[PDB]
């Protein structure tokens, strides 16, 4: 029915809503897609569409990878950049000294942390104790758990490293676990 | 269960001994299919796909093993993964259109052919798409396919 009014007409059929959408005029509970008696309980992926409108299949190639990962997964990646439709001016210049030195600082800080770890592992400092055990204070706000839902008082927790025997050898053996599976491999763009 | 454990031990020892031979994975997965352990066979095939990602024969046998046990949606997901990983192997595309033509599903076969034509294949796939649309009437859409 059209809309100058819809009173006196109850949806009885699943096609009474057109494609769907419950009518606000009728004050009866309306189910445009039937009973949700059970949950969805489906393990399929969320189907997306692209700009022109087609089913997007790049969720399969990108499955298991983060968003910053560069994955070539379409024929558009096989076209030269100059010939690649929406492509006018292409900037082919090196980054300036500011960005270059910023990346140098970041990478050398990360590698300096790695060098410190490797030097700690390579030759231990004879006796591995540290009596400068400065405490760390934590403000811990408890949630509700194990039945009861009363708001417990929030806590201030002092966390101190435990005094370890300087003579104690390493406590546990090293386990040879086989290698995990690699990162999900990219499409083969031959 | 003793026989199952001994066979699993033998197959896993052959896999650990030489993992770059596809016959060990194929035998282990087929055997685990024979005792209707579909999750185990799927795990073995996915581990083989971790060792051999771009092997077309392993993809074909795993799609076939999924299809012969009437797991249609699993095998269609598998064919989507296979044509995503290897879009330039026409064998996988041909199997995919053949399977979704065998199961009825003519618009599904048409959209698979549309993805294949997006990848700009050789003339054989274009002729196959034209033959598909000519078989079920549909001549004007074959005219856009010729365009």
């Amino acid at each position: 029915p059209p809309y100058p009014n819809r009173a006196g007409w109850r949806p009885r059929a699943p096609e009474d809503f057109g494609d769907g959408g419950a009518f606000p005029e009728i004050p009866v509970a309306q189910y445009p897609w039937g009973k949700n008696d059970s949950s969805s309980k489906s393990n399929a992926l969320v189907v997306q569409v692209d700009s022109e409108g087609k089913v997007d299949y790049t969720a399969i190639a990108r499955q298991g990878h983060s968003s910053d990962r560069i994955i070539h997964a379409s024929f558009k990646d096989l076209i030269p950049l100059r010939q690649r439709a929406e492509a006018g001016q292409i900037d082919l210049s090196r980054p300036s000294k500011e960005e270059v030195e910023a990346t140098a600082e970041r990478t050398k800080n990360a590698l300096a942390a790695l060098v410190s770890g490797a030097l700690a592992a390579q030759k231990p400092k004879n006796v591995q104790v540290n009596t400068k055990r400065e405490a760390t204070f934590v403000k811990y706000t408890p949630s509700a758990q194990m039945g009861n839902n009363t708001k417990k008082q929030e806590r201030i927790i002092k966390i101190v490293e435990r005094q370890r025997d300087p003579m104690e050898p390493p406590k546990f053996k090293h386990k040879k676990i086989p290698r995990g599976p690699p990162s999900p491999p990219p499409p083969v763009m031959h | 269960k003793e026989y199952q454990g001994r066979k699993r031990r033998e197959f896993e020892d052959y896999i650990r001994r030489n993992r770059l031979r596809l016959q060990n994975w194929f035998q282990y997965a087929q055997w685990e299919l024979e005792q209707k352990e579909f999750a185990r066979a799927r795990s073995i095939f996915e581990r083989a796909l971790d060792v051999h990602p771009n092997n077309t024969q392993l993809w074909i046998r795993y799609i076939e093993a999924e299809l012969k046990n009437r797991n249609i949606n699993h095998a269609r997901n598998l064919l989507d993964r296979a044509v995503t990983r290897l879009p330039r192997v026409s064998k996988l595309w041909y199997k995919y259109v053949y399977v979704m033509e065998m199961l009825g599903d003519i618009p599904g076969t048409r959209q698979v052919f549309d993805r294949w034509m997006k990848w700009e294949p050789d003339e054989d796939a274009w002729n196959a798409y034209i033959k598909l649309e000519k078989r079920y009437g549909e001549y004007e859409r074959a005219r856009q396919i010729f365009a």
Partner: peptide, 9 residues
């Protein structure tokens, strides 16, 4: 079909 550039540049 993925469009190409016909500018001859």
């Amino acid at each position: 079909l993925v469009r190409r550039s016909e500018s001859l540049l």
